[PDB]
Amino acid sequence: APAVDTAEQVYISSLALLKMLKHGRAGVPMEVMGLMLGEFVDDYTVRVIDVFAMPQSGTGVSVEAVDPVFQAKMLDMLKQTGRPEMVVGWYHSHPGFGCWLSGVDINTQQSFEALSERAVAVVVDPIQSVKGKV
Amino acid sequence: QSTYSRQIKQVEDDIQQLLKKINELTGIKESDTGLAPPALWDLAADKQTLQSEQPLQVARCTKIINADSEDPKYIINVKQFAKFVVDLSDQVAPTDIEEGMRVGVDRNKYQIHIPLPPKIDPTVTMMQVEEKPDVTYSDVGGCKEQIEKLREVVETPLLHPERFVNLGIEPPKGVLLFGPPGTGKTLCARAVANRTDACFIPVIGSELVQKYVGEGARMVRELFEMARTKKACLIFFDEIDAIGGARFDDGAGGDNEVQRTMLELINQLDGFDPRGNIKVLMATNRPDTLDPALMRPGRLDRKIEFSLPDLEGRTHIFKIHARSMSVERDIRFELLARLCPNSTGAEIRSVCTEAGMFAIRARRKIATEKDFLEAVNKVIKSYAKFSATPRYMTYN
Amino acid sequence: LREELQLLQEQGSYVGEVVRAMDKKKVLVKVHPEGKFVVDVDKNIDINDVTPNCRVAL
Amino acid sequence: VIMATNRIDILDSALLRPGRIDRKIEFPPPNEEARLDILKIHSRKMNLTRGINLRKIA
Amino acid sequence: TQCRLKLLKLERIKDYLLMEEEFIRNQEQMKPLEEKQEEERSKVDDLRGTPMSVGTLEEIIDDNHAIVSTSVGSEHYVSILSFVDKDLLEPGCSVLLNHKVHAVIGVLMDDTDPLVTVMKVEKAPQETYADIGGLDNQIQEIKESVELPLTHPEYYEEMGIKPPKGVILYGPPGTGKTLLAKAVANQTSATFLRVVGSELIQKYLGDGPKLVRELFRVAEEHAPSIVFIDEIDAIGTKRYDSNSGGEREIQRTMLELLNQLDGFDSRGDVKVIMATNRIETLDPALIRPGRIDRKIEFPLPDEKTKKRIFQIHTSRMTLADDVTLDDLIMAKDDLSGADIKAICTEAGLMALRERRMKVTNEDFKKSKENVLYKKQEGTPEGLYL
């Protein structure tokens, strides 16, 4: 809705930024994805603290990868450590597509949105992490 | 006219230059070709971009191999010329994916989305078959005996194989067409094709021989197979003196090219399986200038006679040609026919037409008897003479 | 030099050839080994600004 | 289309045709004057020694 | 001169006004176009996806598909969706595909053959009609045979039956066989494709039957049309090898012609015009009618004809009113068009040596005695024969 949806300028920490670049890089052309742990303050500030990743596949991002089981499983670990984090959004890497969101990537983003209203979608370019511009 | 031509030359040059600028500049001026009915289609089009099944890549199934472990394996050749093995279609029948059949396979997943209409396996055979018209008996001179045999041999077994069973023989695998040229053989051939409702595929022998021999071999085999798919067909090989010439191979001449193409055709004539009710029709000057080796007489069947029109014989063609045409005459068909010497049918047919061209000269619009009389005298001399090589010394 | 890190990234740049310009306000360029591509007119060209058989930078 | 040839017997009659050929330019076989001229130009670059005469060579 | 000039000045000026008026229309003046079409273009280009990857549209399937061959190297079975209709696409043309996922966006552009570009030369004779006079009877015939069945259907329709399908122009060069083909073609404005016979026999084998069928087939697609086959004597005359001379090469090319012209494959009201300087090389089957129809023979120029043949050559140069035509008829006669070209060239050649930059009677006379001798000399005189 135009009356409550505003963009989320993401403050990305060292732990998230490095994690995402490395994970995509090794998998190539197998694409990796995951949920992002962080905290949400303001009506627009998201700090991305840390990430864990979902199943890689040789077709890359798909509906099959996204299951509530992985997420639910993680949350139980979050309690046990005594970490508080709610889910800020999700990430993926596209070596096999550009920054444009692929047809399977939108499907995957819609599911993740149902769980956290404020959801962000990130393209990582693992390939570019080899060169000095990322 | 030297001074006058320069003036005109300069004036065009200037006007022509200015034109270049105007044309380029105007263009279509940022318009859209689709207009209003495609707007709804744009929204669809976007959904397809997201989709993985679109775009499909056309390919063809080359070979059937089973070592099945999912659903039936086929090896297809992609048009980037990488071979890939794909599997049975996502929902469509296995009976639609065949050897030498075209298939649409996904660009991103490479599995058969849908099969497509068959054949694109040769490049060359597809090129060699050309357009087909129909001309009828009216237009082709004579109701003679020579004309009558063409019908009886070609039309009857293909139209009704029943007649040919009754007699106790098979419908011809082969059929031979012979007679010297300039008699309307091709014309007659077109005319029986319509009646029979038997598709005729015209073929040229000159395309078959090529610099490196082997292309013509694969072409001929592929060509028989295509025809075999068609039911009650004729493969009409026109103007062949490759598959049509002398039996001999020099062994450093273009004669090598002829001999490979002939040799596969012999294999095809017998077949990998026989060819009951399939006719190949071949045109030669006469059967004595055709191979005794490619001619293995049981298979070829009847040899259909066409011969050079006689003086009586040309009297007959000329009534057909004249009657078909719109002409106003006083003089008769027989006189003018006797007027002609024994030469070819073709001079005598041209008389009927030339009388119409003399009418435009004469400043009429339709022919008259005097135009007719003028046409015989010029035509007999013109076409016959001022032609042919002036040597038949030192040839093989 | 700092800025050069950002500047160097592209999707490459080529030398192509204009087979013909077209009066449809799009231009046909063929990259040297790869097939033909139709692309729109830019700001930097129109159709009086590219004429047949011009090798071009892309 | 300007033509050059070594000899006049290795040509086609069609080329030899007067209506196609506007002008015909005749060259003799190698002469003494031509050979003197070539030797002299090259001697400037070459070394020499006393008692060489290009005229005997030519 | 003065009579022409007022109109000439006005025509150039009318054309200037026409150029200048275009500029005001593209830059300022708009009413249906406006800001609105500008936006339609932006919106269509972004949806369409630049770069557009070229395809060729072979055929359209009505269900929202088309069979495209992408020009990159590997073909694709696309959908017809997005800014085009099935009927809006046309066969044998170049089309735009969305680069990301191939559906056929549309036909703006047409595809020309590679073959046709080389073959083709523009229609118009450098010697204007009614100044290719000299065998003036003969010039008329071609206008009747090739040009007329296409120009005027009335006579043909009443006449009935098949129309003409060619002419053969034969006899000694210089009687202007090329100028005639170009005239009829100019008038009709039928695409004039032109190939020399020597292209039919080149080093590669089977190029001859190949080139001739493609040339015709292209003429039928771009129809109505005139195909000119210039100077088919080469078939036998030339050889790059043993395979390129000899019977196989000669036959294949002749055989192709026979099927193509009237045979099964036929041709439309597309005419073939053949120039040949020798029908010694040519067969009785391509001198046969009803795939040649009227043949035009040019004989050697007659004494009276020769004066009219000489005038044409004189018109291309500077116009004579001081050449004695009788001396030319007296000196040589029953020699070609090519001989009249030979007298003219030699006159121009002597004037060139002085740096005289005109021809006059004097240049024609001086050169004329040597040229007649020279004609005999062209064919061997040996040692003393």
Curated annotation (Swiss-Prot), chain B:
Keyword RNA-binding carried by entry: no
Annotated SUPFAM superfamilies: P-loop containing nucleoside triphosphate hydrolases (SSF52540)
CDD domains per the UniProt record, alphabetical: RecA-like_PAN_like
Sequence intervals crossing the membrane: none
GO MF annotations, alphabetized: ATP binding; ATP hydrolysis activity; general transcription initiation factor binding; proteasome-activating activity; TBP-class protein binding
Modification after translation (UniProt): Monoubiquitinated by RNF181.
Domain of life: Eukaryota
Cell location: Cytoplasm
Chief location category: cytoplasm
Keywords: Acetylation, ATP-binding, Cytoplasm, Nucleotide-binding, Phosphoprotein, Proteasome, Ubl conjugation
Binding annotation for ATP: 179-186
Record carries keyword Acetylation: yes
GO biological process, one term: proteasome-mediated ubiquitin-dependent protein catabolic process
Modified residues (N6-acetyllysine): 79, 385
Protein family per UniProt: Belongs to the AAA ATPase family.
Protein's job: Component of the 26S proteasome, a multiprotein complex involved in the ATP-dependent degradation of ubiquitinated proteins. This complex plays a key role in the maintenance of protein homeostasis by removing misfolded or damaged proteins, which could impair cellular functions, and by removing proteins whose functions are no longer required. Therefore, the proteasome participates in numerous cellular processes, including cell cycle progression, apoptosis, or DNA damage repair.
PANTHER family, A to Z: 26S PROTEASOME REGULATORY SUBUNIT
Name assigned to this protein: 26S proteasome regulatory subunit 7
Origin organism lineage: Eukaryota, Metazoa, Chordata, Craniata, Vertebrata
Curated annotation (Swiss-Prot), chain D:
Domain of life: Eukaryota
Compartments (UniProt record): Cytoplasm; Nucleus
Annotated function: Component of the 26S proteasome, a multiprotein complex involved in the ATP-dependent degradation of ubiquitinated proteins. This complex plays a key role in the maintenance of protein homeostasis by removing misfolded or damaged proteins, which could impair cellular functions, and by removing proteins whose functions are no longer required. Therefore, the proteasome participates in numerous cellular processes, including cell cycle progression, apoptosis, or DNA damage repair.
Family statement drawn from the similarity comment of this UniProt entry: Belongs to the AAA ATPase family.
Subunit structure: Component of the 19S proteasome regulatory particle complex. The 26S proteasome consists of a 20S core particle (CP) and two 19S regulatory subunits (RP). The regulatory particle is made of a lid composed of 9 subunits, a base containing 6 ATPases including PSMC5 and few additional components. Component of a complex with USP49 and RUVBL1. Interacts with PRPF19. Interacts with TRIM5. Interacts with NDC80. Interacts with PAAF1. Interacts, in vitro, with the thyroid hormone receptor (in a thyroid hormone T3-dependent manner) and with retinoid X receptor (RXR). Interacts with ERCC6.
Protein name (Swiss-Prot/TrEMBL): 26S proteasome regulatory subunit 8
Organism from which the protein derives: Rattus norvegicus (Rat)
High-level lineage: Eukaryota, Metazoa, Chordata, Craniata, Vertebrata
Swiss-Prot record, chain E:
Residues bearing the modification N6-acetyllysine: 203
GO biological process: proteasome-mediated ubiquitin-dependent protein catabolic process
Membrane protein topology class: Lipid-anchor
GO cellular component, one term: proteasome regulatory particle
Main location: cytoplasm
InterPro entries: 26S_Proteasome_ATPase, AAA+_ATPase, AAA_lid_3, ATPase_AAA_core, ATPase_AAA_CS, NA-bd_OB-fold, P-loop_NTPase, Prot_ATP_ID_OB_2nd
Region entry Disordered, spans: 29-49
Transferase in keyword set: no
Modified residues (Phosphothreonine): 379
MF terms in GO: ATP binding; ATP hydrolysis activity; proteasome-activating activity; TBP-class protein binding
Cross-link annotation Glycyl lysine isopeptide (Lys-Gly) (interchain with G-Cter in ubiquitin), location: 182
Phosphotyrosine carried by residues: 384
Signal peptide: none
Gene3D superfamilies on file: 1.10.8.60, Nucleic acid-binding proteins, P-loop containing nucleotide triphosphate hydrolases
Keywords: Acetylation, ATP-binding, Cytoplasm, Isopeptide bond, Lipoprotein, Membrane, Myristate, Nucleotide-binding, Nucleus, Phosphoprotein, Proteasome, Ubl conjugation
Superkingdom classification of source: Eukaryota
Residues reported to bind ATP: 171-178
Record CDD domains: RecA-like_PAN_like
Segments of skewed composition (Basic and acidic residues): 31-48
Location within or outside the cell: Cytoplasm; Nucleus; Membrane
Subunit (UniProt): Component of the 19S proteasome regulatory particle complex. The 26S proteasome consists of a 20S core particle (CP) and two 19S regulatory subunits (RP). The regulatory particle is made of a lid composed of 9 subunits, a base containing 6 ATPases including PSMC1 and few additional components. Interacts with SCA7. Interacts with NGLY1. Interacts with PAAF1.
Reported function: Component of the 26S proteasome, a multiprotein complex involved in the ATP-dependent degradation of ubiquitinated proteins. This complex plays a key role in the maintenance of protein homeostasis by removing misfolded or damaged proteins, which could impair cellular functions, and by removing proteins whose functions are no longer required. Therefore, the proteasome participates in numerous cellular processes, including cell cycle progression, apoptosis, or DNA damage repair.
Family: Belongs to the AAA ATPase family.
Protein name (Swiss-Prot/TrEMBL): 26S proteasome regulatory subunit 4
